[PDB]
Structure formats: structure tokens, C-alpha cells
Amino acid sequence: HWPEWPQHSDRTRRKIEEVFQSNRWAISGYWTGEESMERKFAKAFADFNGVPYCVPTTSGSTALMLALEALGIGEGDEVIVPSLTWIATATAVLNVNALPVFVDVEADTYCIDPQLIKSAITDKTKAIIPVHLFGSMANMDEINEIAQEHNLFVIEDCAQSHGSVWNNQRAGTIGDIGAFSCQQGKVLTAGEGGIIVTKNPRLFELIQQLRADSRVYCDDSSELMHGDMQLVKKGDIQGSNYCLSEFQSAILLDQLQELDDKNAIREKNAMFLNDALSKIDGIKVMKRPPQVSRQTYYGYVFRFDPVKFGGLNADQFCEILREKLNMGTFYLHPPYLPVHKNPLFCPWTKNRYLKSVRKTEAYWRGLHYPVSERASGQSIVIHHAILLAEPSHLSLLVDAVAELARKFC
Amino acid sequence: IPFDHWPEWPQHSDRTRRKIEEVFQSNRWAISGYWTGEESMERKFAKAFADFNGVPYCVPTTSGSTALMLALEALGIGEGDEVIVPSLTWIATATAVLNVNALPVFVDVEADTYCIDPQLIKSAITDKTKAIIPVHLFGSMANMDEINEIAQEHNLFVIEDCAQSHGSVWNNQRAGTIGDIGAFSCQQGKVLTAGEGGIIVTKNPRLFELIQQLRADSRVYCDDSSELMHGDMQLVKKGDIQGSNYCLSEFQSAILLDQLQELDDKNAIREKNAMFLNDALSKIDGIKVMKRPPQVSRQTYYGYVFRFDPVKFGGLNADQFCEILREKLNMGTFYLHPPYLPVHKNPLFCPWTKNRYLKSVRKTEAYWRGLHYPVSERASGQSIVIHHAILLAEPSHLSLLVDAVAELARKFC
Ligand SMILES: Cc1ncc(COP(=O)(O)O)c(CN[C@@H]2C[C@H](N)[C@@H](O)[C@H](O)[C@H]2O)c1O
Numbered sequence: 001h002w003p004e005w006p007q008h009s010d011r012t013r014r015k016i017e018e019v020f021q022s023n024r025w026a027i028s029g030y031w032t033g034e035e036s037m038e039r040k041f042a043k044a045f046a047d048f049n050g051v052p053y054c055v056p057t058t059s060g061s062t063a064l065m066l067a068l069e070a071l072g073i074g075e076g077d078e079v080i081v082p083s084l085t086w087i088a089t090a091t092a093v094l095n096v097n098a099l100p101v102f103v104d105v106e107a108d109t110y111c112i113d114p115q116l117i118k119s120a121i122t123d124k125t126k127a128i129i130p131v132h133l134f135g136s137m138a139n140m141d142e143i144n145e146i147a148q149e150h151n152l153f154v155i156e157d158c159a160q161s162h163g164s165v166w167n168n169q170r171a172g173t174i175g176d177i178g179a180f181s182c183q184q185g186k187v188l189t190a191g192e193g194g195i196i197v198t199k200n201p202r203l204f205e206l207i208q209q210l211r212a213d214s215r216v217y218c219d220d221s222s223e224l225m226h227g228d229m230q231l232v233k234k235g236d237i238q239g240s241n242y243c244l245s246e247f248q249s250a251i252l253l254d255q256l257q258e259l260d261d262k263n264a265i266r267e268k269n270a271m272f273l274n275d276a277l278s279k280i281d282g283i284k285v286m287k288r289p290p291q292v293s294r295q296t297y298y299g300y301v302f303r304f305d306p307v308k309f310g311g312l313n314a315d316q317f318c319e320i321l322r323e324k325l326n327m328g329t330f331y332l333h334p335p336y337l338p339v340h341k342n343p344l345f346c347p348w349t350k351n352r353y354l355k356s357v358r359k360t361e362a363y364w365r366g367l368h369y370p371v372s373e374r375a376s377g378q379s380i381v382i383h384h385a386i387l388l389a390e391p392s393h394l395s396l397l398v399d400a401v402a403e404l405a406r407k408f409c
Numbered sequence: 410i411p412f413d414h415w416p417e418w419p420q421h422s423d424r425t426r427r428k429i430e431e432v433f434q435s436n437r438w439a440i441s442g443y444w445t446g447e448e449s450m451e452r453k454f455a456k457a458f459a460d461f462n463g464v465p466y467c468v469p470t471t472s473g474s475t476a477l478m479l480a481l482e483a484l485g486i487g488e489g490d491e492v493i494v495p496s497l498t499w500i501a502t503a504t505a506v507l508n509v510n511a512l513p514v515f516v517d518v519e520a521d522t523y524c525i526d527p528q529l530i531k532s533a534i535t536d537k538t539k540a541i542i543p544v545h546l547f548g549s550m551a552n553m554d555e556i557n558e559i560a561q562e563h564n565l566f567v568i569e570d571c572a573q574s575h576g577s578v579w580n581n582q583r584a585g586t587i588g589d590i591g592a593f594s595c596q597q598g599k600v601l602t603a604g605e606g607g608i609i610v611t612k613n614p615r616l617f618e619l620i621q622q623l624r625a626d627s628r629v630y631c632d633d634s635s636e637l638m639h640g641d642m643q644l645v646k647k648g649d650i651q652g653s654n655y656c657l658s659e660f661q662s663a664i665l666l667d668q669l670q671e672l673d674d675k676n677a678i679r680e681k682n683a684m685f686l687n688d689a690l691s692k693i694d695g696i697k698v699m700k701r702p703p704q705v706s707r708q709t710y711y712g713y714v715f716r717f718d719p720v721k722f723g724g725l726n727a728d729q730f731c732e733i734l735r736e737k738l739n740m741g742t743f744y745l746h747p748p749y750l751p752v753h754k755n756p757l758f759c760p761w762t763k764n765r766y767l768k769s770v771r772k773t774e775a776y777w778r779g780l781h782y783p784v785s786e787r788a789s790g791q792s793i794v795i796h797h798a799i800l801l802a803e804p805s806h807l808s809l810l811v812d813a814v815a816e817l818a819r820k821f822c
């Protein structure tokens with residue numbers, strides 16, 4: 001059968017056990033003798049990425065929101081985001097009362113096309129959110145150059161690329177702030193979870209306050225007594241409670257340990273598949289940027305020519321492969337419809353949002369981003385747990401697609 | 410039982426461990442994970458909480474604060490709206506309102522319940538007002554008879570903030586079931602906790618579906634829960650309303666299911682002890698316990714509150730009173746402390762510092778800091794809150810607190 005995801009061991013279980021033995025289940029819970037799982041996780045992930053500051057939080061969505069809040073973003077601002085991504089990239093912007101402004105993606109990476117960014121920049125633009133989508137990385141060299149020239153911040157959405165390396169720098173480390181999801185499907189997971197990283201110490205403080213009802217850590221854990229609060233008032237910036245449970249921080253500490261190993265396994269299997277699948281006619285694989293030395297695969301993506309597969313759309317191509325391979329819709333599916341065409345994206349439906357950002361239904365749906373729209377219609381996405389199988393088991397994917405090619409010659 | 414130590418919080422057992430194991434056995438850690446043959450912990454917990462509360466619909470979420478925020482969104486509250494809240498509460502009650510681009514409007518609390526004073530609500534009502542958020546604070550309930558009458562007369566919604574009152578009963582209805590939507594926190598210090606978490610409940614079927622969508626990126630569960638395969642998504646697109654991800658992890662939903670098992674009985678222990686304290690403490694001259702309305706047949710005590718007259722206690726404030734008591738009982742600060750400052754005076758409340766909030770609602774430091782609610786203001790200076798863990802001790806342990814308070818009265822007689 002196909003690999004399950006997530007994967008736990010007894011180390012997972014021990015880490016939970018430590019939480020129960022601590023009797024501290026939240027960071028807003030008082031000190032009970034030793035450091036919290038949150039801070040231990042924050043340190044370990046920050047060292048994993050060679051970045052100095054990390055603040056855990058509740059989700060990838062909330063991580064983006066906090067990041068935007070920390071950069072002073074608000075009413076009247078525009079934030080540039082890719083047309084092809086999971087809707088959270090966009091709705092995070094809406095959630096801080098800014099307008100997301102879409103830009104199409106490159107055909108070979110499905111990451112935001114730096115050559116189209118300039119043309120979307122306006123007086124209101126304050127930031128860009130590139131997404132390291134599926135199993136690639138947005139072009140951070142070009143994107144940082146554009147941002148530096150137009151005075152814009154850069155928030156990396158690393159939800160699908162935990163541990164990717166671009167010119168010796170881990171994903172999330174290269175813009176001003178890096179945002180991560182630890183939702184079940186992701187390569188680093190506790191069911192739900194969020195992470196922020198940054199090199200900037202001012203941002204570190206503001207992000208703590210944003211996620212802890214305006215509080216920061218105390219100056220020195222080492223002088224806390226049993227019963228004392230570790231979180232203390234600051235009030236430089238208003239926050240709400242987006243604190244990660246100690247149970248989740250503990251599982252992340254466990255899961256982190258096997259991250260680089262499992263990423264290399266995935267990456268090598270992506271390679272196998274590129275080699276295999278590219279030999280089939282009318283199957284295109286993604287192009288790896290030179291700058292990337294280590295690529296994390298959350299989803300492995302290839303493209304098909306509908307002219308050589310009997311006019312199949314990817315919904316149908318995927319329904320066939322799922323029946324032929326005996327794997328479900330979590331494991332195999334087309335990319336997200338681009339955000340403006342995605343029924344889950346519907347800001348006009350809620351009053352919270354400003355009149356000026358919710359536009360109308362026709363407004364948003366009538367937008368056009370042809371690379372993104374094509375990609376959704378003629379690409380197949382394989383969930384990364386499949387990149388943890390035996391290469392002999394992967395050859396079943398290759399043959400299933402070789403059989404489909406053969407049939408529709 | 411002789412005294413050895415004050416009870417601590419939280420409290421687990423091996424049933425808690427087994428609930429975590431079941432999550433591992435399931436191989437489903439998020440409600441956004443693939444179907445593995447049985448319903449989520451989320452759903453199991455929702456159904457359990459629904460039954461406990463006598464309420465048709467239940468949707469877990471991530472925190473009390475998000476529960477409040479999502480309840481507001483689900484009632485269509487947004488820019489240009491006002492929402493009435495009490496001055497005396499935790500700041501999340503107000504900041505959840507600012508989060509949806511509405512203006513929180515403070516009303517003072519009643520002297521002998523510290524819950525929103527219904528007689529002051531009419532005066533704060535304007536054309537912008539769309540809802541009231543009563544808080545069932547510490548170990549009282551807001552007056553839902555009066556609040557619902559005012560709400561009906563003025564076409565306002567009512568969201569009950571139940572974070573400090575899980576299981577309280579007003580005229581044979583559980584707290585959270587009486588207004589349009591109930592919101593709950595399951596943060597560590599609460600009586601029902603998984604360290605973090607939240608709950609939303611409603612009677613209204615349309616609100617149930619909206620709330621589902623508001624917490625799972627505009628998704629609901631697929632219709633036929635048992636006509637999908639292992640490895641399939643169970644959340645399907647719906648898109649009636651724009652949502653975000655405010656899904657509770659299966660590990661937390663699992664913990665809550667275990668904890669909920671014991672909730673009613675641990676609440677009864679607390680309440681039996683609160684009554685004993687009210688008996689004992691009300692006999693000390695200068696001490697005033699809170700008044701419990703006859704509509705309340707079960708009161709959940711997140712905190713036991715009593716008041717003191719500084720005139721009869723040497724001019725001490727609450728902070729000093731608490732410090733003495735903690736010294737003499739060897740009790741920690743988490744368990745015995747004055748109540749909250751009023752929200753408008755709380756330093757953690759500083760919405761003007763945040764550009765994300767609309768200029769029109771964040772206003773200025775001068776605006777918020779310069780408000781005045783006397784009853785609520787005096788609360789922190791002359792009240793003592795006992796965290797509910799201490800109420801799981803034996804009655805003879807609690808008598809030690811009574812004697813400490815009585816001794817201190819004697820000194821100043
Ligand atoms: C680029 C990007 N940015 C932000 C996010 C949001 O993070 P979370 O709030 O942790 O979900 C995601 C997660 N996206 C996933 C996508 C998946 N199809 C869905 O079923 C799942 O619930 C969600 O976690 C992402 O992929």
C-alpha cells in the first residue's frame with residue numbers, strides 16, 4: 001500500500017508525555033520548572049534554518065496575518081500575491097484590511113513571475129508574498145531586487161517548502177519575514193500549527209505581542225520560579241491569542257528531527273520521477289532553479305498535453321489515475337484552481353471586509369491569469385508521502401501514465 | 410483528608426493519554442486530513458459538547474477569542490457596526506469586535522455580580538448597534554432574561570461569552586444556548602481545557618453551516634460521511650461565506666473529549682465548595698460575596714469572587730489583601746489575585762498601536778483610556794478571585810482561607 005501521513009514513533013509519544021509530566025499545556029500557563037515546548041521548538045527550528053528569531057503560532061494562515069500586521073499593513077495597502085496558490089495566501093491579506101493584487105506565475109515553476117510584478121506595483125503596494133509552491137521556490141534574487149527598488153517588504157510563504165535552500169539560505173530566511181503551516185498534509189506537522197521566522201529583532205518582539213494579547217517573554221526564564229508567569233506585558237502592539245498548544249509544539253520538536261532525512265528521500269524520489277516521466281511524450285516536468293541546492297516537496301507536480309491524452313482535463317486525468325493507483329483525493333489531485341476562480345475565495349460574502357476590498361463576485365471571477373488557469377487544468381499533483389515509497393512502488397505511477405499515453409497516441 | 414498542598418491545574422489521567430493514542434491510531438491529526446474510516450475527534454467532541462449543552466449545533470475552533478470573532482462574522486457584523494460589551498472582562502471580549510472592523514462599546518457591570526448591567530445597555534444603544542456580548546464572568550451569569558428582552562426590543566443579536574462558565578444553567582438552559590451564539594475558550598486555566606481551544610454553539614441551522622465555513626476556508630463536511638474512501642478529503646467546497654483556517658487539532662479535540670467526561674462532576678465539586686465559602690465568608694463583617702440570581706440552578710466557577718470593604722480592612726487594596734493571604738496560606742499568584750482592570754484601562758488593550766485596525770475604530774489612546782465605568786474600576790481594587798482549582802480542595806482546606814480572612818478582619822476591628 002501507499003505511505004500514511006503523518007508518521008509518528010515512540011519519540012512522538014515521549015514528547016507528549018513530557019507535556020503531561022510538566023503540567024503546563026499553554027505558554028500562557030505558568031512556569032513549572034523547565035522551559036516550555038514552545039521555546040524549545042522555537043530554538044530548534046530557528047537553528048534548523050540558521051535564522052535568529054522564531055515565533056510559533058496556530059496555523060500557516062495566522063502566520064501570514066501576524067507577519068502582515070507586524071509590517072504595519074492595513075487599510076488602503078496592496079499586497080502582491082501569486083494567482084496560483086492556496087487561498088490562505090490571499091485571504092491573509094484581506095484579513096488585515098489590505099487588497100491582494102494577483103500576479104501570474106512562471107510556466108516552469110508555478111511560482112510568482114518576477115517579470116509581471118513590476119507592472120502590478122502601485123502607490124498602495126507595500127509588500128509581496130511569494131509562495132514556494134509545491135516543490136519549487138520563487139525567484140528570491142529577482143524578487144528581492146524588485147522589493148528593494150520599490151520599498152516593499154517580502155513575506156515568504158513557506159507552507160509547502162520547509163527546509164528548502166536557495167543560495168545557501170533556508171526558505172523563509174531570505175525575505176523580511178518567513179511564514180509556515182504545520183497542517184497535517186505538510187512536511188512538518190502537528191495536525192495544525194504555524195511558524196514565523198525573521199532575522200529582524202524588532203519584528204521578533206512585535207510578532208510575540210501579536211500572537212499573545214500584547215505580551216512578550218520575560219527577560220530571563222532562568223530566574224522564574226514555579227508558579228510565575230513567563231509571558232509579561234508589553235503593549236507596544238496590540239495582539240490576540242494565537243498561541244500554539246504545548247502538545248503541538250512538542251510534536252513539532254519530534255517531527256523536526258527527521259525533517260532533513262525525509263526531505264532528501266522525497267527529493268531523490270522526485271528525481272527518479274522526473275527521469276521516468278519526462279521520457280513519456282506530452283509530459284512536462286517542472287524546472288529546478290540553479291539557486292536551489294535542497295528542494296522540499298510537499299507536492300510533486302507534472303504536466304500533461306491534453307492533445308496527447310484525448311482532451312482529458314486534469315480532474316479526469318486524476319480520477320483515472322486514482323482508480324488505477326488506488327489512492328484518494330488527498331494523495332492525488334490537480335493544483336488548486338487559481339485563487340480568483342476558486343469557489344473558496346468569496347470575500348464579497350462578508351461584512352467584516354471593506355467595501356473597497358470585496359469588490360463584486362464578477363470583478364474577481366472575471367480576472368484573468370492565463371498561466372495559472374492553464375496549470376490547474378493540465379497538471380497533476382502527487383502528495384509527498386508518495387515520495388516516501390519504494391522506487392519500485394513509484395514505477396507503478398510511471399507505468400499508469402505510460403499506459404495512458406500509449407492508449408491516446 | 411489533612412491538608413498537604415493546594416490543588417493544581419490542569420489535571421489529566423490515563424484516559425487523557427488514551428485519547429491521544431486514539432488520534433495516533435486514527436492517523437488523522439486535522440479535520441483537513443484524509444478520511445481513515447471513522448469520524449474525526451472534532452466531530453466526536455462536537456457531538457459530546459452538543460449533548461452536554463443541550464444545544465443542536467456545535468463547532469470547535471482554536472481559541473475563545475476566535476470563537477467570539479467567528480460568531481460575530483457569522484451574524485454579518487462588520488464595518489460601521491457597534492457591539493456592546495462589559496467593561497470588566499478579559500480584553501479578548503473587546504478585541505474580537507475590533508477584529509471584525511466593528512467598534513466595541515463598553516457598558517458598566519453590576520456591583521454584586523460583575524456582569525453587564527442590563528439597566529445600562531439601553532443608553533449605549535445607537536443606530537450602529539447590532540449585538541451585545543454578555544460575559545458570564547468568574548462565577549456569575551449575566552442576566553439573560555433582561556438582556557434577551559432588550560435584544561428583542563432593539564433587534565440586536567446576543568453572543569454569550571462563556572469562557573468562564575462552561576456548564577452553568579440559567580432557567581434550565583446551559584450557558585451559551587440562550588443567545589444567538591455561545592462562545593467558549595478552552596485555554597489552560599479554564600475548567601474545560603486542552604491548553605488551547607475554542608468552541609462555538611448555536612441553535613440555528615444556517616449559522617451552524619456558516620460557522621463551519623468560517624473556520625475551514627469556506628468548507629463544510631461532505632454530505633455522506635460514509636460514502637468516501639480511505640485517503641479522501643472529507644472537507645468539501647461550499648463558499649456561501651468566506652472563511653479562514655480556524656480548525657482545532659485532533660489532539661486537542663481528543664483531550665477535550667476526555668476532559669468533558671469529568672466536567673459536570675468537577676463543576677459540582679467547585680459549586681458545593683463555593684456555596685460553603687459564601688456561607689462562611691458572608692459572616693465576616695466587611696466581606697460581601699456575590700449575589701446569585703434564582704434563575705441560576707448550576708453555577709460554574711472559573712473564579713470564586715468575594716468583595717471587601719477597605720474601610721474595615723485597614724485601607725488595604727486587593728493587591729495587598731491578596732499578597733497577605735498568599736503568604737499565610739502559601740498559595741500561588743495564579744490561584745489568588747484581584748480581578749482584571751477594566752478593559753479600557755488594561756495595558757494589553759492598545760488598539761491604536763495597530764495599523765491593521767481601522768482608524769475609525771482604533772481611535773486614540775486618549776479616547777479609550779479616558780472612558781469611565783466606576784463599578785468596573787473599583788472591582789480590581791477591592792475584590793479577591795480564587796481560581797477554581799482551589800475549589801477542588803476539601804471544605805476543611807478552604808476553611809483555612811476563611812480563617813485567614815477572619816483573622817485579618819479581627820486585626821482591623
Ligand atoms: C501556500 C500556503 N499558504 C498558507 C497555507 C495556510 O496554512 P494553514 O492555515 O496551516 O492551513 C497553506 C496551507 N494550505 C493547505 C492546502 C490544503 N489543500 C488544505 O486542505 C489544507 O487545509 C491547507 O492546510 C498553503 O499551502
Ligand SMILES: Cc1ncc(COP(=O)(O)O)c(C=O)c1O
Nearest residue numbers: 241472473474499501572594596
Ligand atoms: C471572558 C473571556 N473571553 C475570551 C477569552 C479568550 O479565550 P482564549 O484565551 O482561549 O482566546 C478568555 C481567555 O482568557 C476569557 O477569559
Ligand SMILES: [Cl-]
Nearest residue numbers: 336337342344
Ligand atoms: Cl482548492
